[PDB]
Symmetry: D2
Subunit: 115 residues, 4 copies
């Protein structure tokens, strides 16, 4: 799995469970086309989004559906979703972990790219 | 000024200066969209993007051009840009500060929302 | 004002008001330490902690009393406080803004350091 | 292992490897007494700091030696170290993960507490 998404909850100090995540790849005409999606597990992680074969170089967008997450918890959120937009580059063997740490009015996100 | 954008640099410990910012508003057709744009000052702030009159209720996207920022400093960062998407003015007019703290492979963003 | 502390609330999207802040400076004996203290204003800022004269070179610790903050709002947070430890003025006088963005189980902190 | 420390590097987008971490427990006289220490692994993680038996309720401080980390990379840092101070509470079965995401002039830290 060249791509993994991990989401944490900064209010409860826990994995953010059952968060919907949609990934898109930018198409030639500049539009975003659906690529992969899923919901985070009990560990706050989403594995198996794509394969090495499918995850070619290109520009990708990872949308984390934070608004629904907070709504299900009865908490008023600011953002519609969190978005992470990046270019995947074939610089030797690499795995991409996109992490996000969520609060109602703020989030942090980072990439951990390893071989 | 009901909308202000502030950007900081976590590598240098300074305001992030000359960062391009583009704001979009979702249209009736569900497309993004252009609404306003500008660049951060020497204080890392961008004021005067809009007016109370023009900044009506809607879904807005603030795109902060982080890649251009890092590349102008000779660094190859991870993200294309930082995107902040939110509904504004759904309970009447508010003042919004959208802040972002930037590193080459990471960013954080928060909003401070006040009522005049 | 060579030292300013700013605190934001990531739950409410607001300045963190009335947050107690204690600053310490490492002494010759290697103990912390008292140096200055105060509380954030309605803007979430704490100015006037010290003067250019008193704020000499040294190792400083800014302790932000986050637990007291969250408990006064009826929340049980993870951390006792947020601690920011840094050497100041080692290359001559600078102006320091120490910022912290607070959530019940998390915080971020950054410094903006400028030269007058 | 009731306590794990994880450190990430926001400049390189990688685990922060070989970072020294010192844990202290607050003693009756209010002083901090050494409790456990180690260095993060290639995954940026530090496991095996303590046992269930030893990790009783109390106030703990986790010091992450960020200054030396940045110095070894030739990068000028702001902080002497990052410090995380918290009370451990016996509210049923719990594991504490203290995470920190490091930049030269900033860091974020969060707790993930799970059963
Ligand atoms: O996964 N993490 O450990 C972790 C910690 C702090 C963070 O701020 C983030 N982040 O920005 O996504 C991730
Ligand atoms: O505005 N600030 O001072 C400030 C501090 C820390 C932060 O993490 C952020 N942020 O996420 O945008 C902003």
């Amino acid at each position: 799995c060249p791509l993994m998404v991990k989401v944490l909850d900064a209010v409860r100090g826990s994995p953010a469970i059952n968060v919907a995540v949609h990934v898109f790849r930018k198409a030639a005409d500049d539009t975003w086309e659906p690529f992969a999606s899923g919901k985070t597990s009990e560990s706050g992680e989403l594995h198996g989004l794509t394969t090495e074969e499918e995850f070619v170089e290109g520009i990708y967008k990872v949308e984390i559906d934070t608004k629904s997450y907070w709504k299900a918890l009865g908490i008023s959120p600011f953002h519609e979703h969190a978005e992470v937009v990046f270019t995947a580059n074939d610089s030797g063997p690499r795995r991409y972990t996109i992490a996000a740490l969520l609060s109602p009015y703020s989030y942090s996100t980072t990439a951990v790219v390893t071989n």
